[PDB]
Amino acid sequence: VASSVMDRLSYLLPSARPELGVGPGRSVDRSLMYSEANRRETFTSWPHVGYRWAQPDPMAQAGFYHQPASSGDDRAMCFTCSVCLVCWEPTDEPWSEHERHSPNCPFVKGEHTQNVPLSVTLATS
Amino acid sequence: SVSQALDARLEVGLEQQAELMLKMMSTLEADSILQALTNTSP
Amino acid sequence: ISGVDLLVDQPFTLEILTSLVELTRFETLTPRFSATVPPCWVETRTWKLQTDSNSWDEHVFELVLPKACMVGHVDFKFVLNSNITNIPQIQVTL
Amino acid sequence: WLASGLDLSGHAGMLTLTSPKLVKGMAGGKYRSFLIHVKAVNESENLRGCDLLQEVSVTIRRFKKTSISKERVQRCAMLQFSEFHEKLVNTLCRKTDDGQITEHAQSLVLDTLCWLAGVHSNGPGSSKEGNENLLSKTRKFLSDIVRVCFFEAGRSIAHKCARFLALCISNGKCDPCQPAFGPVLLKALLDNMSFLPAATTGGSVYWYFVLLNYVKDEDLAGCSTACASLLTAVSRQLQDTPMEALLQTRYGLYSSPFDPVLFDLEMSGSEIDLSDVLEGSFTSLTGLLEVEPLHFTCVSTSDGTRIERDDGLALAISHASHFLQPPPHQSIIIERMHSGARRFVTLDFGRPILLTDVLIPTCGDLASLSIDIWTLGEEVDGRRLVVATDISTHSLILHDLIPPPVCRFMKITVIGRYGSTNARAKIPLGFYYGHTYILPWESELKNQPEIDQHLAMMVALQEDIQCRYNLACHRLETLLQSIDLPPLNSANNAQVEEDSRVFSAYQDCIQLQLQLNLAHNAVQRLKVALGASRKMLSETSNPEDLIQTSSTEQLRTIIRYLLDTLLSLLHASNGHSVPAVLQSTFHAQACEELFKHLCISGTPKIRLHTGLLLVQLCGGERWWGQFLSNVLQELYNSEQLLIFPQDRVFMLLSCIGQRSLSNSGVLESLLNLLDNLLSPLQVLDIPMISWVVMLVSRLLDYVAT
Amino acid sequence: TARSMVSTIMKFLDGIHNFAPLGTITSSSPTAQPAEVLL
Numbered sequence A: 001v002a003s004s005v006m007d008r009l010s011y012l013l014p015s016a017r018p019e020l021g022v023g024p025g026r027s028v029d030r031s032l033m034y035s036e037a038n039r040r041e042t043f044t045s046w047p048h049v050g051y052r053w054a055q056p057d058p059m060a061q062a063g064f065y066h067q068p069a070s071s072g073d074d075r076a077m078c079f080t081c082s083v084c085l086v087c088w089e090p091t092d093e094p095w096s097e098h099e100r101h102s103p104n105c106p107f108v109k110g111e112h113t114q115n116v117p118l119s120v121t122l123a124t125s
Numbered sequence B: 001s002v003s004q005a006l007d008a009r010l011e012v013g014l015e016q017q018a019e020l021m022l023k024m025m026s027t028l029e030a031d032s033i034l035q036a037l038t039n040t041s042p
Numbered sequence C: 001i002s003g004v005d006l007l008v009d010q011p012f013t014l015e016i017l018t019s020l021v022e023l024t025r026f027e028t029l030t031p032r033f034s035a036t037v038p039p040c041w042v043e044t045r046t047w048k049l050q051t052d053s054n055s056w057d058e059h060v061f062e063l064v065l066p067k068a069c070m071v072g073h074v075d076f077k078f079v080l081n082s083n084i085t086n087i088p089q090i091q092v093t094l
Numbered sequence D: 001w002l003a004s005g006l007d008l009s010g011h012a013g014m015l016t017l018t019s020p021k022l023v024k025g026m027a028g029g030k031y032r033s034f035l036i037h038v039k040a041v042n043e044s045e046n047l048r049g050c051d052l053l054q055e056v057s058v059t060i061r062r063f064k065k066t067s068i069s070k071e072r073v074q075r076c077a078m079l080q081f082s083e084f085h086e087k088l089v090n091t092l093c094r095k096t097d098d099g100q101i102t103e104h105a106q107s108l109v110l111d112t113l114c115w116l117a118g119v120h121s122n123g124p125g126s127s128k129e130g131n132e133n134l135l136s137k138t139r140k141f142l143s144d145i146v147r148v149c150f151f152e153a154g155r156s157i158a159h160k161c162a163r164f165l166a167l168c169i170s171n172g173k174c175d176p177c178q179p180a181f182g183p184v185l186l187k188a189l190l191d192n193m194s195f196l197p198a199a200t201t202g203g204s205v206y207w208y209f210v211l212l213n214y215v216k217d218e219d220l221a222g223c224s225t226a227c228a229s230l231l232t233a234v235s236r237q238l239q240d241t242p243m244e245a246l247l248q249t250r251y252g253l254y255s256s257p258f259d260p261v262l263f264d265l266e267m268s269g270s271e272i273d274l275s276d277v278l279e280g281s282f283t284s285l286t287g288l289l290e291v292e293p294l295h296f297t298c299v300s301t302s303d304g305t306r307i308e309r310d311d312g313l314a315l316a317i318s319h320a321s322h323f324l325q326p327p328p329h330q331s332i333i334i335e336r337m338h339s340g341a342r343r344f345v346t347l348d349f350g351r352p353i354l355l356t357d358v359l360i361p362t363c364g365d366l367a368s369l370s371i372d373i374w375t376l377g378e379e380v381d382g383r384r385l386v387v388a389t390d391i392s393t394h395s396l397i398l399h400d401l402i403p404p405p406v407c408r409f410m411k412i413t414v415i416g417r418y419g420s421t422n423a424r425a426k427i428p429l430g431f432y433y434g435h436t437y438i439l440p441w442e443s444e445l446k447n448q449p450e451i452d453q454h455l456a457m458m459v460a461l462q463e464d465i466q467c468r469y470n471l472a473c474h475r476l477e478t479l480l481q482s483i484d485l486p487p488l489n490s491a492n493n494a495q496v497e498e499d500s501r502v503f504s505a506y507q508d509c510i511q512l513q514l515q516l517n518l519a520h521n522a523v524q525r526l527k528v529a530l531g532a533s534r535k536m537l538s539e540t541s542n543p544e545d546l547i548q549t550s551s552t553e554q555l556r557t558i559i560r561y562l563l564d565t566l567l568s569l570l571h572a573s574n575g576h577s578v579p580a581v582l583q584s585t586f587h588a589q590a591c592e593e594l595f596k597h598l599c600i601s602g603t604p605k606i607r608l609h610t611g612l613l614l615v616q617l618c619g620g621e622r623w624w625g626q627f628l629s630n631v632l633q634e635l636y637n638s639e640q641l642l643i644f645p646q647d648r649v650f651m652l653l654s655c656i657g658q659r660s661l662s663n664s665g666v667l668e669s670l671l672n673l674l675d676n677l678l679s680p681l682q683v684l685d686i687p688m689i690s691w692v693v694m695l696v697s698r699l700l701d702y703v704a705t
Numbered sequence E: 001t002a003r004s005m006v007s008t009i010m011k012f013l014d015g016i017h018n019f020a021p022l023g024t025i026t027s028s029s030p031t032a033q034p035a036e037v038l039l
């Protein structure tokens, strides 16, 4: 609830919206990436949009963001457990991959975290 | 016993609980038969 | 209601019984329907129940179909607690 | 209440809610919204009632929109005017003079009967007049419909009738003036056991026996005495040649290679050693002769996955026989394993085919498997069959899909177990079962040749495989004439190219006999598909006559099944007092006759199982040691000309004596038999004396243990 | 002294072979390590 409130407050003020710095050799702001829209915005340079299950919208809602080490790779990190994931496959289901690679991730067990759903941001736009 | 596996395409039908109850008769049958083989005569 | 050609008085021909059987099938609703639940449940539609005792005595779910059509049936699937040792006396009524 | 939808585990459940009053109120065309109420009724996290639910899911399924308009009055006709229902019962009774009712029409009327029973299951104050009338018309002609459905029908019609009858069991919300379905279904079930050995399918009588075993809890005496009489009759019938007996003694070959007809084939992915008991789920897949297997061709394969194999009319007949073959065992190997190894394979049958039964062996290193089928496209007609998440516990068994789907392409998706080690394993494809010819009514569910030419070529194939089976039998007989027959009794028999060639000839004879029988079942299914019917059980038929004119394999199978029912009946007492009726009809000489007629020539499984029946029924009787002494003296004489497997029945005798050691008469009678035996040491028979002293030594080792 | 049929038909109901792995080992004095590795 508090995470959705602060994300809505950040969205209401354009002066408190820093630019999305997606690039190699530069770490991202995890506190700013608590919103789902930023996580799905990080996948603009995704080279595997044509994959059946490796699409930006289904994999971003699982709590992943694109933090590429170069131009053209598929390195997607979690914003809560920071699981190192490389060499993504077209058959890699995002929920199943997050369960397999990080069963201790709170999204797999379903407990309430600092995640901000996109519906709350759309209802408070 | 047997695997807890049932027809998923039959869930659109009305007899899913019917097959489910037939299967639990079958499992109680298997359990009772194993118990009758293992138990001796008092 | 009178003056209607019924489906009962005819002899047992193959085509009439086949049409009756082909009538009695069921289809899946498409697109998504509408429904609201009390807020203790968090999220073909699914929900997970949270331990809230504010309205434990009664629970009312409301369903609105996208179009008034021929109602076949409603499928209600549930998964209970894993540590259950006694059969609960809980009823669900439409 | 919640008790009408719980699963086997009890941790989940599903309800399908509908009513005739829903469409009765929808006839006005006014309703669009609904409410559902969850309420806890009463007479750590202490969750009570509504708080006990973990996960919920809602779906709504609509009705099929047909080309027949004004369907509202058509549906209200059966609910308002009841003269349809008894007419349906008439179509079940075959009393109407308007021709002869086929099996497809019976299936359709039974389907609509099932649908009307389902809608009439719960009537919230709605007029149940029609429901009471149809239930009364069902009970009035129940014997006729159970006779024409479970004895004079195939697997589909009998399975559907069992489904309808158990649904009538399920919705037994009868008024206080109406009796329950239990007593009457029990009486109708025992009124037709006399026609049992003249049945057709193992699965039909299997479901029949399941219903008998479930509903026998109400009344025990009549079913018990009828069952005992049928035991005695089929046991005195089965005793009537030394040929399969000699095979059983010399090589332990129990299936008759000369009787050309069987009843069913039993196999599962899970002789028998008697030491562990000193296989219950194997009855999951029955009736595999009426349904032939297929052949497998892999098309698509995922990464890190490989499917391997585990280690001019005559030409057309040979090709049709090659299409009619059990394929060798194949499997899937995985290169790299991990926790949740998601792999995908596709199998092709080569043509549209009907699929009925599927069997997947137990794979202990896999978490879950899922099967999809489709004929043309993945998104065109793809429907999910089963996903199982406990492959490591038990095997996947899915039996007699009704209605039988048609398909051409199999999709197998496998997810490996959590924390799986990186050690290679095998996932067998299992055995797939279906129908080679697609019926026109079953084709319309989801270049087809006509029935007559297809029937003719199967008849030609049946004749050719009958000739092959006859020449195989002649070769087997001429080879077994060449078996050594020493005068050293049987001790040296238990102590070779000839053995290997006999085993090969018996395996070939069994394979061709099975092929011939399933081909005969195929020509029978097409012959009844032409418009004919199977064997009609006439009312003037003597039960003993049809007992005598039944096949020996059918008699063996029916004995194993109903003595399985007897095992369940003995266990249903929960260790309490056994009823006196089956304890009184199974006296000493009847028990001795049953032992001498079933355990001497029968298969080891039914032999051990009937021994278990005898110890769980008459274990405490005073005459058991005397019976053992008599059967030892009258079986193991040096002058005994009977050809019986002395070693295996001797180990079984030791096992049943070790079970009956709780009785104090067995040890006393065996030592008295010894005292009588070496009384001349106050001619000598060294082998029989050795047999009995090693028997009493094993029994005393059990006593000491 | 020959083996008769009884030994044949009882031998399997339950070429010189080793028997050291079946038995156990011990010593009268407390050693620094047990000798079961020898077995």
Ligand SMILES: [Zn+2]
Pocket (backbone or CB within 6 Å): A063, A078, A079, A080, A081, A082, A083, A098, A102, A105, A106
């Ligand atoms: Zn994570």
